[model samples]
Target: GLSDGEWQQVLNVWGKVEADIAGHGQEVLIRLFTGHPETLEKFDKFKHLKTEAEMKASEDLKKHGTVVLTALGGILKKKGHHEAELKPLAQSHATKHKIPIKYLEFISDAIIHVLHSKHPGDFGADAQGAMTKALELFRNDIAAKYKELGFQ
Candidate 1:
């Protein structure tokens, strides 16, 4: 469980970052593809778009990025059952999409990188620490759900 201070850090950092959700989302995807080229292979539609410009210009990429960031926005809003909210995403990624847990961690790390790049000051040790903890918990939840579905 995050302390009030940690949650405050999350709210502060995300509040600033969420302003340009699409842009950040796009960057996240681009970085992921660049860092781990195989990730693009997972997406049937995105597999062909090898270039960054191609991916950037892609409507599908935009849509997918929006979905990813929008989900983060939902969790950041902290208005519902946080863990419960992520279940469908975890289940879908695990069962339907069959995304590996390492890929999930890669995305999470990319998010933190983006956060740091976008707002270095806001994402100090405290904020980074808190966000890391929060994301790790979320990843663990996803992993557990994935395992529960008998995916090894």
Candidate 2:
């Protein structure tokens, strides 16, 4: 098991690459498993989910991560704008995916306050920038970590 800092880095990597591999299916999941075998060993649900839900949860996890990146942008905005780009997906996802719209709206609102208040910027740019950064960070971090841990 990794220390708290390592876990944070792991999540950062996870959050970053989730969207890219998310659409790929078992291949990506296999890579994730192969890359973070040790971390998987430490996880409470690793054994239970390693076989099934972990793979299936990839999309759900990716959606949550993307929403978080959007929320992060909202926090970094100047005037607390709720970046309309995010809400559409939340609303559409809620209706299409059968999640709660009201909760999603609330989450979007909360993310705005959390993100915009922290970093000031153009929300759209921030969203794209963060997404890009997360992707790069994930790619680099995973490659490096896997090498250090001696896995694929």
**Best model number under TM-score:** 1
The digit string of per-residue lDDT tens for model 1 on 10-119 reads 77777765788787888889889989998888899899896888988988787788789888778766733477688888888877887999998999999898888877
lDDT of 2 by residue, 47-85 (tens): 355554564565554454455454443432312223353
TM-score of 2: 0.24
Best-fitting candidate, measured by lDDT?
A: 1
Residue 25 error, candidate 2, Å? 19
Residue 77 Cα positional deviation in candidate 1, in Å, after optimal superposition: 3.1
As for model 1, its CA RMSD to the true structure in angstroms is 1.8
lDDT of 2: 0.40
